[PDB]
C-alpha cells in the first residue's frame, strides 16, 4: 500500500525521508511504527520529507509509516485555564487529562480587514511607565525588547498578574526557556491566583526543534478560542528570537536555501503569520480581541539585527528596555525615549490622559536637556525647573518587581509629582513617599479611590480633595 502507508528511508537529524505515501497533503501528520508523530513539508517527486516531532532515535530505516490524514489539530476549551500545557497540548504538570470538546488548527488564516476595528479598549499592565506613555490596547500587537536579563519577562510577569478577574484570559508561551525558570514563573503566578486564567504553552531547550516552532502557534490557537467567543486575550511569546532560531534548524536539516544569518526564506512569515492572528474583531464577530506582547532578545543593543528588525516592522509599538539604564536606579528600565505606541493614547481612559499626556510632554522635554544637568555649571531656571521636575517623575516610574499598581493607584500617584507636590523634595527619598502615601490612601481614604475609578476621571472635587491629601501628606515626611 504505497497510497496510505510507506517505508522510512532515512532518519537523519530529527528529519525523516518517507518513501511512497502518494496521498499525503502538505501539512498533514503521519505516524510511525514506534509511535512517533510528524508533519509533512516536502512532497517531493518520489519521496516525502517529514520533520519529526520528538526523539527520532526510535525510527528505524524500514519501519512503515501510516497517514493520520489529519492536518495538525490541537484541542482547546476552558478546561485549561491553569494547566502548564505542552506543544501538542498534553499536560506536563501531572494533573490528569484536559477535557476537550472542540479542536482548532495550529495554523489558520488571520482576521481580515473588515473583520476588524481600531483599538479603543484599554489594557492595564500595572506599570506606571507603560500604561501612561506606552499605551497598549486590546487587539494591538505590542513588542517587548531587550538584551539578556533586561527585565522583559518581569514586564510580562506583572502584566498578566495585574489582570482583574473575568477581564482578560492570558496565554504564556515560553520558547527556548529553561524548565526551571518556567517553574519559578509558573509558581509566582499561582501564589497570586493569576493562574486561574493563564495557560503555559512552553517548550524547553531540551525539547526537539520541530515543536519550538509550534509553541507560539499553539498558544495562538488556544487564545483564538476566546477571541471569536467575544472574550479578550493577552499572549506573551517569550523570545520569538528563539523560535526564529528554531526555524533555521528545520530548513537547513530539510536542505533548503538559506540567506542572511543562515535564516531561510520565510523568517518573516513565522511572525507575520502569527502576530497578525492578533487583533480586535469588529462587533459583527463578537467584539472579541487578543493582545500579543512578544519578546525578542537583542545582542548588545543591536536593534537593527535581522530578526529584531522584522518583528519591529510587524508590531504597533515598542517598549525598549536598556542594559545600561538598570543599576542607575531605573528598575524596571523603560527606554520611554525610544518606546512607542502606534495605537496612540486611544488605548487609554480620560483620567490617565489628563495626567499621562501632560507627563508625556514633560518627560519628553527633559529628554532634550538631560545630559546638561551633570555639566550644568550655570543654567537658567526655565531649564532648571525641568532638570528638577525631571528625575522626580522618574523615581515614580520606578517600580519594585511583582507589584502591579491598579489604575486608581496609577493616576493618583502620578498626580503627586506631575502637579508640583514632589518638586522641592529630595530624589533619593521620593520612592518611599509614594509607597507610604499609596497605602495611606488605600487605608484611610479608599473612599476616594473608588470615586476615581467609577467616574473614570478626577472631578473638580476629588482634585482639591487630593490636594488636601497629598500636600498634608508630603507634610508627614
Amino acid at each position: 500500500k504505497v497510497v496510505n502507508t510507506g517505508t522510512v528511508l532515512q532518519v537523519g537529524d530529527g528529519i525523516a525521508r518517507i518513501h511512497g505515501l502518494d496521498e499525503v497533503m502538505a501539512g498533514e501528520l503521519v505516524e510511525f511504527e514506534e509511535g512517533t508523530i510528524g508533519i509533512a513539508l516536502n512532497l517531493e517527486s518520489n519521496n516525502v520529507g517529514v520533520v519529526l516531532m520528538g526523539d527520532g532515535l526510535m525510527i528505524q530505516e524500514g519501519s512503515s509509516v501510516k497517514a493520520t490524514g489529519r492536518i495538525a489539530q490541537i484541542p482547546v476549551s476552558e478546561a485549561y485555564l491553569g494547566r502548564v500545557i505542552n506543544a501538542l497540548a498534553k499536560p506536563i504538570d501531572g494533573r490528569g487529562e484536559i477535557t476537550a470538546s472542540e479542536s482548532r488548527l495550529i495554523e489558520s488564516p488571520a482576521p481580515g480587514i473588515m473583520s476588524r476595528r481600531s483599538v479603543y479598549e484599554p489594557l492595564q499592565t500595572g506599570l506606571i511607565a507603560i500604561d501612561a506613555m506606552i499605551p497598549v490596547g486590546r487587539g494591538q500587537r505590542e513588542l517587548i525588547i531587550g538584551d539578556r536579563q533586561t527585565g522583559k519577562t518581569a514586564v510580562a510577569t506583572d502584566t498578566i498578574l495585574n489582570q482583574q478577574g473575568q477581564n482578560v484570559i492570558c496565554v504564556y508561551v515560553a520558547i527556548g526557556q529553561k524548565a526551571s525558570s518556567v517553574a519559578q514563573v509558573v509558581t509566582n503566578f499561582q501564589e497570586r491566583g493569576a493562574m486561574e486564567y493563564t495557560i503555559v504553552v512552553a517548550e524547553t531547550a531540551d525539547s526537539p526543534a520541530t515543536l519550538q516552532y509550534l509553541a507560539p502557534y499553539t498558544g495562538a490557537a488556544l487564545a483564538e478560542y476566546f477571541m471569536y467567543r467575544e472574550r479578550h486575550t493577552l499572549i506573551i511569546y517569550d523570545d520569538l528570537s528563539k523560535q526564529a532560531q528554531a526555524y533555521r534548524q528545520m530548513s537547513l536539516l530539510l536542505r533548503r536555501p538559506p540567506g542572511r544569518e543562515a535564516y531561510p526564506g520565510d523568517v518573516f512569515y513565522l511572525h507575520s503569520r502569527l502576530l497578525e492572528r492578533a487583533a480586535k474583531l469588529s462587533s459583527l464577530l463578537g467584539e472579541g480581541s487578543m493582545t500579543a506582547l512578544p519578546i525578542v532578545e537583542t545582542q548588545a543593543g543591536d536593534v537593527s539585527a535581522y530578526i529584531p528588525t522584522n518583528v519591529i516592522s510587524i508590531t504597533d509599538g515598542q517598549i525598549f528596555l536598556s542594559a545600561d539604564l538598570f543599576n542607575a536606579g531605573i528598575r524596571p528600565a523603560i527606554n520611554v525615549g525610544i518606546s512607542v505606541s502606534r495605537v496612540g493614547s486611544a488605548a487609554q481612559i480620560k483620567a490617565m490622559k489628563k495626567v499621562a499626556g501632560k507627563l508625556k510632554l514633560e518627560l519628553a522635554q527633559f529628554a532634550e536637556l538631560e545630559a546638561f544637568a551633570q555639566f550644568a555649571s550655570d543654567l537658567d531656571k526655565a531649564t532648571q525647573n525641568q532638570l528638577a521636575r525631571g528625575q522626580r517623575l522618574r523615581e515614580l516610574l520606578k517600580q519594585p518587581q511583582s507589584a502591579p499598581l491598579t489604575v486608581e493607584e496609577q493616576v493618583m500617584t502620578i498626580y503627586t509629582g506631575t502637579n508640583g507636590y514632589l518638586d522641592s523634595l529630595e530624589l533619593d527619598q521620593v520612592r518611599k513617599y509614594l509607597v507610604e502615601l499609596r497605602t495611606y490612601v488605600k487605608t484611610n481614604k479608599p473612599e476616594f479611590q473608588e470615586i476615581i475609578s467609577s467616574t473614570k476621571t478626577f472631578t473638580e472635587e476629588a482634585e482639591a480633595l487630593l490636594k488636601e491629601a497629598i500636600q498634608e501628606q508630603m507634610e508627614r515626611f
Binding site: 499525503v24 497533503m25 502538505a26 476588524r116 476595528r117 519591529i312
Partner: protein, 467 residues
C-alpha cells in the same frame, strides 16, 4: 489544460503536463482541491519556468496547505486576469481581483492582464509640473513632479505610512482625479485604518451613488510570497486603465514596494536559482523594473505614484532599496537618528532630492533658499563633531551664527500632522510653498536671530513661530 501536481515544496508547485501542453511562462494555472473537507479553487499559481521533462514550476498566490500530488491543474490559456475599470472604486480587492470588502460581486466590464508591456519610447513625456504637498521640507528641498514617481525611503518605523497618509489627506482627498492605494506587504491595521478614515472623509461611497475616486487592493503581511510580489501589479493593472482608457490623471499610493521585492527574494531560491548580493535573487533588477515603468505618465494621461520603500537594517547600500532610486524623480530618505530627536516628519534635509530642484521649473527664491538652507545644514553638520569637543569659545562670531540659525532651520523643518495628532499632541498645519519659502527667507536673513529655537519647533508658519 490538465496537468498533475508533482512536487509541493512550500509556495512552489511543480505541475506536470503532457509533452503537448506547456503553459506559457507567466500564464496562470489553477489547482482543484485543498482545505479541510471542502472543494475550493482559491489555489491559483503563475507559471515561471519550464523545468523541462514535461514540467513547469510555479508559485501559488494562495496557501498550499492541504494540497496533494496527483491533483489536476489547468492551463487557463493566458495570464491572471484582474477585472478593471470604474467598477473597482470604493471596493477592496484580492491579488486575484476578488472582492474582499464584502459588498457583493464586482460588476466589471472587462478583465485585464497584470503582465503588460510598458509604454513605448514615443509614448513618454517631459512636462514638469509641481505637486505642493504641505510639508516644510518636501516642496522646498525635494519637490514632486507630476507624472513623476516619488521614492519615500526610511527604516523600520520612521513615518513612511503616516507620510503616505498626509499625502492622501493633502493631495488625494482633494485630487481632481482618481487614485489607487496598493497594499503591498504591510500591517492589516494600516488597511482597516486607511479604510474607516477614507470612509468618514467621504472618499468611499457613503451611499452607492458611486462618487468614489479611489480603488483598493490589499495583500497584507500574512499572505504567502507569490501574492505581495504581485498585488503591486493588480493595484497597477487597475491604474493602467484609468491612465490610458479614461484619459485620467491617477495616483498610485503603494505602501512599501520593498515588500514586493522581499517576497520576491523568497520564491527565488525556492524556485532553484542562485542567490545574489545580500541573499537577494539574481532577477532583482528585472523584477522591480518591469513594474515601475508601467507606473508612469504617458501622453494619454498621467500617473503620479507616491511610493514607499523599506530599508533593511537602516542600510541604504542594501540591494533592494538601492535599486529603487534609479526609478525616481525625487526621494525622501527618513532618518532614525533625526527621528530619535523628535523632529517629524523625520526627513534628512540633506538626503532627499528631486529633479525639479531647478530654477527653470520652480523659481530662484525657491531655488536659492533651498540651497541656502542646506548650506548651513552642511555647515553645522560639519561643525558638530568639532564643537562637540572643541567647544565654542574660539568659534568666530561669523560661525556661531551658523549654529543658532541652523538650529532654527532644523527646528522650523519640523511640522506636526493631521494624522499624527496622536504623536505630536498639537493641531496640524498645511504649509504650502510661498508660506514655506518666505518663512525660511526670514531665517536665512537673521531677521529672527533673537527668537529661541523651540519657537520654530512644531509650528505651522513663521508667524506661528513668532507667537
Amino acid at each position: 489544460n490538465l496537468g498533475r501536481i508533482a512536487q509541493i515544496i512550500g509556495p512552489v508547485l511543480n505541475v506536470a503536463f503532457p509533452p503537448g501542453k506547456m503553459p506559457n511562462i507567466y500564464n496562470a494555472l489553477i489547482v482543484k482541491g485543498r482545505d479541510t473537507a471542502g472543494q475550493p479553487m482559491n489555489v491559483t499559481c503563475e507559471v515561471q519556468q519550464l523545468l523541462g521533462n514535461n514540467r513547469v514550476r510555479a508559485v501559488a498566490m494562495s496557501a498550499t496547505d492541504g494540497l496533494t500530488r496527483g491533483m489536476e491543474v489547468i492551463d487557463t490559456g493566458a495570464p491572471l486576469s484582474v477585472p478593471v475599470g470604474g467598477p473597482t472604486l470604493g471596493r477592496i480587492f484580492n491579488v486575484l481581483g476578488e472582492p474582499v470588502d464584502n459588498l457583493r460581486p464586482v460588476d466589471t466590464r472587462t478583465t485585464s492582464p497584470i503582465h503588460r508591456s510598458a509604454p513605448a519610447f514615443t509614448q513618454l513625456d517631459t512636462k514638469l509640473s509641481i505637486f505642493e504637498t504641505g510639508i516644510k521640507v518636501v516642496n522646498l528641498l525635494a519637490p514632486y513632479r507630476r507624472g513623476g514617481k516619488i521614492g519615500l525611503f526610511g527604516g523600520a518605523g520612521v513615518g513612511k505610512t503616516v507620510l503616505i497618509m498626509e499625502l492622501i489627506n493633502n493631495i488625494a482627498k482633494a485630487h481632481g482625479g482618481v487614485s489607487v492605494f496598493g497594499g503591498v506587504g504591510e500591517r492589516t491595521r494600516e488597511g482597516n485604518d486607511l479604510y474607516m478614515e477614507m470612509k468618514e472623509s467621504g472618499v468611499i461611497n457613503e451611499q452607492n451613488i458611486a462618487e468614489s475616486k479611489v480603488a483598493l487592493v490589499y495583500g497584507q503581511m500574512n499572505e504567502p510570497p507569490g501574492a505581495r510580489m504581485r498585488v503591486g501589479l493588480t493595484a497597477l493593472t487597475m491604474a493602467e486603465y484609468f491612465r490610458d482608457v479614461n484619459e485620467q490623471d491617477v495616483l498610485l499610493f503603494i505602501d512599501n514596494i520593498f515588500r514586493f521585492v522581499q517576497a520576491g527574494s523568497e520564491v527565488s531560491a525556492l524556485l532553484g536559482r542562485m542567490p545574489s548580493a545580500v541573499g537577494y535573487q539574481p532577477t532583482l533588477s528585472t523584477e522591480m523594473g518591469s513594474l515601475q515603468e508601467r507606473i508612469t505618465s504617458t501622453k494619454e494621461g498621467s500617473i503620479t505614484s507616491i511610493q514607499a520603500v523599506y530599508v533593511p537594517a537602516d542600510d541604504l547600500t542594501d540591494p533592494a532599496p538601492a535599486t529603487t532610486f534609479a526609478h525616481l524623480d525625487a526621494t525622501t530618505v527618513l532618518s532614525r537618528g533625526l527621528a530619535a530627536k523628535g523632529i517629524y516628519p523625520a526627513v534628512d534635509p540633506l538626503d532627499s532630492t528631486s529633479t525639479m530642484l531647478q530654477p527653470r521649473i520652480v523659481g530662484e527664491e525657491h531655488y536659492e533658499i533651498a540651497q541656502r538652507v542646506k548650506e548651513t545644514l552642511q555647515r553645522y553638520k560639519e561643525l558638530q563633531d568639532i564643537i562637540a569637543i572643541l567647544g565654542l569659545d574660539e568659534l568666530s562670531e561669523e560661525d556661531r551664527l551658523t549654529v543658532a540659525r541652523a538650529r532654527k532651520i532644523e527646528r522650523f523643518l519640523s511640522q506636526p500632522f493631521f494624522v499624527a495628532e496622536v504623536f505630536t499632541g498639537s493641531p496640524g498645519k498645511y504649509v504650502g510653498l510661498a508660506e514655506t519659502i518666505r518663512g525660511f527667507q526670514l531665517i536665512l536673513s537673521g531677521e529672527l536671530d533673537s527668537l529661541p529655537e523651540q519657537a520654530f519647533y512644531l509650528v505651522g508658519n513663521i508667524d506661528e513661530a513668532t507667537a
